[PDB]
Design an enzyme around this catalytic site. Structure first.
Site, PDB file in Angstrom:
ATOM      1  N   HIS A 176       0.806  -1.218   0.000  1.00 18.82           N
ATOM      2  CA  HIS A 176       0.000   0.000   0.000  1.00 18.82           C
ATOM      3  C   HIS A 176       0.852   1.288   0.000  1.00 18.82           C
ATOM      4  CE1 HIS A 176       0.142   1.224   4.275  1.00 18.82           C
ATOM      5  NE2 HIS A 176      -0.114  -0.031   4.650  1.00 18.82           N
TER       6      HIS A 176
ATOM      7  N   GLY B  65       2.470   6.184  10.434  1.00 19.16           N
ATOM      8  CA  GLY B  65       3.879   6.020  10.093  1.00 19.16           C
ATOM      9  C   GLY B  65       4.475   4.702  10.565  1.00 19.16           C
TER      10      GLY B  65
ATOM     11  N   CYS C 236       3.411   1.641   9.772  1.00 18.35           N
ATOM     12  CA  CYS C 236       3.268   0.630   8.718  1.00 18.35           C
ATOM     13  C   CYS C 236       4.627   0.094   8.288  1.00 18.35           C
ATOM     14  CB  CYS C 236       2.496   1.186   7.527  1.00 18.35           C
ATOM     15  SG  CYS C 236       0.782   1.658   7.898  1.00 18.35           S
TER      16      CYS C 236
END
Ligand SMILES: NC(=O)c1ccc2cncc(NC(=O)Cc3cccc(Cl)c3)c2c1
Ligand SMILES: [Cl-]
Lengths: 296, 300
Positions: free
Chosen positions: A41, A134, A136
């Site tokens: 993503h 942030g 991820c």
């Protein structure tokens, strides 16, 4: 003495964390050998990926910019081929864990590790983590001797504040998808084999108030477990608890009768290992390791 | 979202752990630059522990009596000195993995990460707090002596604790990295007991502000309190007195949530009176006191 929620030493994983930027999105990547792994993503994912070139992906390892020389997708993970092998790559494996299993999480922001905590894969496949925007690409792992087994990569937060992610091969844990849509964690249950392991840890540390003279059948306990949203206890769980049963002298079904009495009557103002709730995020192996001091 | 007991990444400290052996005793040392720091009780026998004269025991030792092992490499000891309850072993090699560091002495209520080690090998990391009675509720077995407590704010490691002993109640006692004990403890196997422990009030308040930040307000009420009335009630539940410094420190969290510190003190008074009534706050059925105001701002 003492019983803490203990994570594995994070050093071998810290040396693998990098920052991955694609356009306006910045998240974390895992740099192993000459490949950087991160959630796809960051970029119809095949249609979006075909429009990208190697120089669109900015990879930063500390104060050094890595050059991306290739890119491919494997399930929900993006694999960025870089021109430099990570000299700090530890011995590693990618392993998929089962609900109830525990692991350490190195929470990162901008490719910089900020904290480490221990957690468990819930029966509903979510993790009750602590993540902000942030995070991820932050990873979950266990250590066996000198080998790091990577088992989780963070992808998203669900509306209830719980977290969802994939194994390092990009397969989600749970019925989740990596897109903004109506997704909800299923009704969660308590990890019974882990609560029992934590009751054995309390006995080892000198907490015996909850013990009783009674025993139970596995069938009678499983009816009680079903009534209190506890996961069913299988014969494999009973076998796995064997060592702790032999150490303390309390048969697994004897410890189940204690758990049954605790479920039907509560703690009565008392605590077990400093907790007023029944703790389910320590496996039988975590209890044996913390009450034996295995090193890495 | 979420709120976990979070430790600092331990990598910078793992690269400093070594094994120190003197005779039959083996424990952990901290290798920074060309010095290895470890508890001075490594020079003792179990008999010596009742009334050890460390100066008398140390003068009988030579550099080659101390065996220091860093991984699979034996370090050569070229000097030794004692500073309070810490032994400083000068070695012939500077640690190439030495991070940017400071030695800091913390106050009760302050939190830190512990890298528990055995035989110079790290086994686990956990977060804990210096209790008001100067003990720590750690998880340490025999061989863990010399394990260290630290904070990593920015890229600098601040070493604040070195493990020395376990008290009869299962709690732990130790020193700062200059060898001064936290609390009225001595590195002697004499009858020593931890004083009555209390709850860190400023930390419970910080954790109540963390719950409000994460969306939970069930415990709030329409009342306020004076600081004196709050202290008169909270001291009846074995809570530490809340000072004006604590109220000042909670200022940023009060401004962020819109709940005045003395209004949060009124919710705390009520929680102590009523209990939780089957409810939890941030996944806990007890009032948590091992998160400082600084930890809450850092994590939330
Ligand atoms: N099984 C143990 O002997 C044990 C368990 C947990 C332990 C946890 N921490 C420390 C241990 N040891 C000592 O406290 C050594 C000692 C004794 C007296 C005075 C000093 Cl300064 C040091 C531990 C031992
Ligand atoms: Cl402090």
């Amino acid at each position: 003495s003492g019983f803490r929620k203990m994570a594995f030493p994070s050093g071998k994983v810290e040396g693998c964390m990098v920052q991955v930027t694609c356009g306006t999105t910045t998240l974390n990547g895992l740099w192993l050998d000459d490949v950087v792994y991160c959630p796809r993503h960051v970029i119809n994912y095949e249609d979006l990926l075909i429009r990208k070139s190697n120089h669109n992906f900015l990879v930063q390892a500390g104060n050094v910019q890595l050059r991306v020389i290739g890119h491919s997708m494997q399930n929900c993970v993006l694999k960025l081929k870089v021109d430099t092998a990570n000299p700090k790559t530890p011995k590693y494996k990618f392993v998929r864990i089962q609900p109830g299993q525990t692991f350490s999480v190195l929470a990162c922001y901008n490719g910089s590790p900020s904290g480490v905590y221990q957690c468990a894969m819930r029966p509903n496949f979510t993790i009750k983590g602590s993540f902000l925007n942030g995070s991820c690409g932050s990873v979950g792992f266990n250590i066996d001797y000198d080998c790091v087994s990577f088992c989780y990569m963070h992808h998203m937060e669900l509306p209830t504040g719980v977290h969802a992610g994939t194994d390092l091969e990009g397969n989600f844990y749970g019925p989740f998808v990596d897109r903004q849509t109506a997704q909800a964690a299923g009704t969660d249950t308590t990890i019974t084999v882990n609560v029992l392991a934590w009751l054995y840890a309390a006995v080892i540390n000198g907490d015996r108030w909850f013990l009783n003279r009674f025993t139970t059948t596995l069938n009678d306990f499983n009816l009680v477990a079903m009534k209190y949203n506890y996961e069913p206890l299988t014969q494999d769980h009973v076998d796995i608890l064997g060592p702790l049963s032999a150490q303390t002298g309390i048969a697994v079904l004897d410890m189940c009768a204690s758990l049954k009495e605790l479920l039907q009557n509560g703690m009565n103002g008392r605590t077990i290992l400093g907790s007023a709730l029944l703790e389910d995020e320590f496996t039988p192996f975590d209890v044996v390791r913390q009450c034996s001091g295995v090193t890495f």
